[PDB]
Design an enzyme around this catalytic site. Sequence first.
Site, mmCIF file in Angstrom:
data_model
loop_
_atom_site.group_PDB
_atom_site.id
_atom_site.type_symbol
_atom_site.label_atom_id
_atom_site.label_comp_id
_atom_site.label_asym_id
_atom_site.label_seq_id
_atom_site.Cartn_x
_atom_site.Cartn_y
_atom_site.Cartn_z
ATOM 1 N N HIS A 142 28.329 47.007 28.365
ATOM 2 C CA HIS A 142 29.293 47.134 29.461
ATOM 3 C C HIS A 142 30.641 47.608 28.911
ATOM 4 O O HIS A 142 31.233 48.565 29.425
ATOM 5 C CB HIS A 142 29.443 45.782 30.172
ATOM 6 C CG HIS A 142 30.518 45.720 31.220
ATOM 7 N ND1 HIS A 142 30.258 45.615 32.571
ATOM 8 C CD2 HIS A 142 31.866 45.748 31.104
ATOM 9 C CE1 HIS A 142 31.396 45.558 33.234
ATOM 10 N NE2 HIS A 142 32.386 45.701 32.377
ATOM 11 N N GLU A 143 31.124 46.941 27.871
ATOM 12 C CA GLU A 143 32.444 47.265 27.346
ATOM 13 C C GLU A 143 32.475 48.630 26.663
ATOM 14 O O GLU A 143 33.418 49.397 26.860
ATOM 15 C CB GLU A 143 32.918 46.209 26.369
ATOM 16 C CG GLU A 143 32.975 44.775 26.839
ATOM 17 C CD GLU A 143 33.836 44.548 28.033
ATOM 18 O OE1 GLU A 143 34.577 45.456 28.489
ATOM 19 O OE2 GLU A 143 33.739 43.395 28.520
ATOM 20 N N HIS A 146 32.861 51.394 29.114
ATOM 21 C CA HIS A 146 34.237 51.730 29.502
ATOM 22 C C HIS A 146 34.819 52.873 28.661
ATOM 23 O O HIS A 146 35.606 53.682 29.169
ATOM 24 C CB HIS A 146 35.186 50.536 29.429
ATOM 25 C CG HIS A 146 35.043 49.572 30.567
ATOM 26 N ND1 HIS A 146 35.100 49.960 31.890
ATOM 27 C CD2 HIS A 146 34.853 48.234 30.576
ATOM 28 C CE1 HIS A 146 34.977 48.889 32.659
ATOM 29 N NE2 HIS A 146 34.763 47.845 31.886
ATOM 30 N N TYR A 157 41.544 52.429 37.041
ATOM 31 C CA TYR A 157 41.072 51.046 37.118
ATOM 32 C C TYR A 157 41.746 50.226 38.216
ATOM 33 O O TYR A 157 42.399 49.209 37.962
ATOM 34 C CB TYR A 157 41.228 50.380 35.759
ATOM 35 C CG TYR A 157 40.294 49.219 35.541
ATOM 36 C CD1 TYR A 157 38.914 49.412 35.474
ATOM 37 C CD2 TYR A 157 40.780 47.930 35.373
ATOM 38 C CE1 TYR A 157 38.054 48.351 35.229
ATOM 39 C CE2 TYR A 157 39.918 46.858 35.135
ATOM 40 C CZ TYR A 157 38.559 47.079 35.072
ATOM 41 O OH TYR A 157 37.716 46.022 34.809
ATOM 42 N N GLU A 166 33.824 49.733 37.020
ATOM 43 C CA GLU A 166 33.139 48.486 36.711
ATOM 44 C C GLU A 166 31.636 48.584 36.925
ATOM 45 O O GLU A 166 30.850 48.139 36.072
ATOM 46 C CB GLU A 166 33.732 47.350 37.550
ATOM 47 C CG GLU A 166 34.886 46.661 36.873
ATOM 48 C CD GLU A 166 34.431 46.095 35.561
ATOM 49 O OE1 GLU A 166 33.392 45.393 35.548
ATOM 50 O OE2 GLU A 166 35.050 46.396 34.552
ATOM 51 N N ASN A 183 14.299 40.048 27.125
ATOM 52 C CA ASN A 183 14.671 39.312 28.321
ATOM 53 C C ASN A 183 15.529 40.135 29.289
ATOM 54 O O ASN A 183 16.570 39.663 29.733
ATOM 55 C CB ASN A 183 15.390 38.017 27.925
ATOM 56 C CG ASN A 183 14.546 37.129 27.032
ATOM 57 O OD1 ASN A 183 13.361 36.941 27.283
ATOM 58 N ND2 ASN A 183 15.155 36.573 25.993
ATOM 59 N N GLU A 190 24.299 36.731 31.466
ATOM 60 C CA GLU A 190 23.500 35.505 31.483
ATOM 61 C C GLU A 190 23.255 34.893 30.110
ATOM 62 O O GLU A 190 23.082 33.676 30.009
ATOM 63 C CB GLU A 190 22.149 35.732 32.177
ATOM 64 C CG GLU A 190 21.164 36.631 31.433
ATOM 65 C CD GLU A 190 21.521 38.112 31.449
ATOM 66 O OE1 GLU A 190 22.316 38.560 32.306
ATOM 67 O OE2 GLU A 190 20.975 38.857 30.599
ATOM 68 N N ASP A 200 22.030 31.050 35.709
ATOM 69 C CA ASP A 200 23.198 31.681 36.335
ATOM 70 C C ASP A 200 23.698 32.879 35.518
ATOM 71 O O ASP A 200 23.173 33.182 34.459
ATOM 72 C CB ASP A 200 24.318 30.665 36.578
ATOM 73 C CG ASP A 200 24.894 30.089 35.304
ATOM 74 O OD1 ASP A 200 24.272 30.230 34.225
ATOM 75 O OD2 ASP A 200 25.971 29.477 35.381
ATOM 76 N N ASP A 226 42.668 41.086 41.068
ATOM 77 C CA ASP A 226 41.663 41.763 40.239
ATOM 78 C C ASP A 226 41.767 43.288 40.367
ATOM 79 O O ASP A 226 40.765 43.975 40.540
ATOM 80 C CB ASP A 226 40.264 41.250 40.654
ATOM 81 C CG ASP A 226 39.131 41.791 39.794
ATOM 82 O OD1 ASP A 226 39.304 42.041 38.583
ATOM 83 O OD2 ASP A 226 38.032 41.967 40.355
ATOM 84 N N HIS A 231 36.044 44.001 39.944
ATOM 85 C CA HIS A 231 34.837 43.237 39.583
ATOM 86 C C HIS A 231 34.141 42.603 40.796
ATOM 87 O O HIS A 231 33.149 41.875 40.628
ATOM 88 C CB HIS A 231 35.163 42.106 38.597
ATOM 89 C CG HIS A 231 35.718 42.560 37.286
ATOM 90 N ND1 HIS A 231 37.070 42.632 37.030
ATOM 91 C CD2 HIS A 231 35.096 42.903 36.135
ATOM 92 C CE1 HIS A 231 37.250 43.035 35.783
ATOM 93 N NE2 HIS A 231 36.070 43.195 35.217
HETATM 94 N N1 LIG Z 1 34.980 40.313 32.770
HETATM 95 C C1 LIG Z 1 35.281 39.527 33.984
HETATM 96 C C2 LIG Z 1 34.943 38.020 33.832
HETATM 97 C C3 LIG Z 1 34.694 37.519 32.410
HETATM 98 C C4 LIG Z 1 35.330 36.205 31.985
HETATM 99 C C5 LIG Z 1 35.941 35.315 33.055
HETATM 100 N N2 LIG Z 1 36.808 34.280 32.427
HETATM 101 C C6 LIG Z 1 36.756 39.653 34.315
HETATM 102 O O1 LIG Z 1 37.561 39.964 33.425
HETATM 103 O O2 LIG Z 1 37.171 39.407 35.456
HETATM 104 CA CA LIG Z 2 24.384 29.742 31.928
HETATM 105 CA CA LIG Z 3 21.610 40.906 31.833
HETATM 106 CA CA LIG Z 4 18.744 39.182 30.002
HETATM 107 ZN ZN LIG Z 5 34.410 45.986 32.696
#
Ligand SMILES: N[C@@H](CCCC[NH3+])C(=O)O
Ligand SMILES: [Ca+2]
Ligand SMILES: [Ca+2]
Ligand SMILES: [Ca+2]
Ligand SMILES: [Zn+2]
EC number: 3.4.24.27
Length: 316
Positions: A142-143, A146, A157, A166, A183, A190, A200, A226, A231
Amino acid sequence: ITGTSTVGVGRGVLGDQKNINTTYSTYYYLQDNTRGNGIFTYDAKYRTTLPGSLWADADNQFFASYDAPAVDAHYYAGVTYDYYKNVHNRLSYDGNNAAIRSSVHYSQGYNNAFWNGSQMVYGDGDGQTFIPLSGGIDVVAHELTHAVTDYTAGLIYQNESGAINEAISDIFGTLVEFYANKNPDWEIGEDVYTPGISGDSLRSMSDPAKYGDPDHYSKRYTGTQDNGGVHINSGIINKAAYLISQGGTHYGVSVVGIGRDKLGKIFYRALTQYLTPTSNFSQLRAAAVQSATDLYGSTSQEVASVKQAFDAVGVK
Ligand SMILES: N[C@@H](CCCC[NH3+])C(=O)O
Ligand SMILES: [Ca+2]
Ligand SMILES: [Ca+2]
Ligand SMILES: [Ca+2]
Ligand SMILES: [Zn+2]
Ligand SMILES: [Ca+2]
């Protein structure tokens, strides 16, 4: 550093053993010379100065608890590099084999990770909300995505362009997770989120509403939090991407899935050929339709499915 390319071994955040490409010059450094201009991993040493020190180890064995976030940042940067090269013929984030730099142990108890315009940065988490965030391949990818966006579409952004930014990172984070094939799922973060809670995640692409995020344009956030919900409103686009790949019926609109490889091809082409810094959701739809048309033809199932998916999330 200048040195001898070698192969060390260590354990990542989740306790899994993996080999890592290192460089020997007195110490064994986390410097992988096998990919582009290199992948370099640094110790921020619980401070906020960046990048910190290039990671040095005496014996090329990285089994200490302190080593684990570095092992994973380094290894997963390599996997992400491999995905972009092998799947999309893109050489690093700039397409010219730019060095990939990551720092771990950023700050104390820091519950996030980020691309700072120049490099990856990973907190250790506080041990309750997160464990060290480089343990998530989707987080790393993900990062790094960017960075790819910075050099391509350059999506600003904030507001809708920012939510696309995002979503692109969640989409490719997930496609890298599937590429590595350990996985894999359509959830975000996760592996590192809430070690005390099973099942979660930070966000869900398959059902964004599970974590309070919109799954239709009618539910979009237009407040100021945000950066205008980057996000949050990403859920609308994540849901469309999930539908394009996997199919489904959403608010009564049916989408025939075309699979993740075609999703990746369509969105990579949209990102690199059609999106611009100010693209909104409607313009993303047009970009995806055009991309699918280029790749598969105007009468293709792929084009039809892109249209159905954006219809399903209320983006015209
Ligand atoms: N990357 C998301 C959430 C990650 C960590 C939340 N404390 C954000 O910056 O909003
Ligand atoms: Ca968890
Ligand atoms: Ca995942
Ligand atoms: Ca996974
Ligand atoms: Zn991001
Ligand atoms: Ca060691």
